[PDB]
Amino acid sequence: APSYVAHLASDFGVRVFQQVAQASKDRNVVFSPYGVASVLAMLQLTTGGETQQQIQAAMGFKIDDKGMAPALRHLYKELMGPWNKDEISTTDAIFVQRDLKLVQGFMPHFFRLFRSTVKQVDFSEVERARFIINDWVKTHTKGMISHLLGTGAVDQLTRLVLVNALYFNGQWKTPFPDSSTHRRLFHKSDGSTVSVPMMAQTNKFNYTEFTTPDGHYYDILELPYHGDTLSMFIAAPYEKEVPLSALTNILSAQLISHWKGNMTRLPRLLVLPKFSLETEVDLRKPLENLGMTDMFRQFQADFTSLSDQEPLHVALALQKVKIEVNESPEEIIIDRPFLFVVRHNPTGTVLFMGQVMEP
Question: Which sites does the entry annotate for glycosylation?
Answer without folding.
Answer: 206, 262, 326
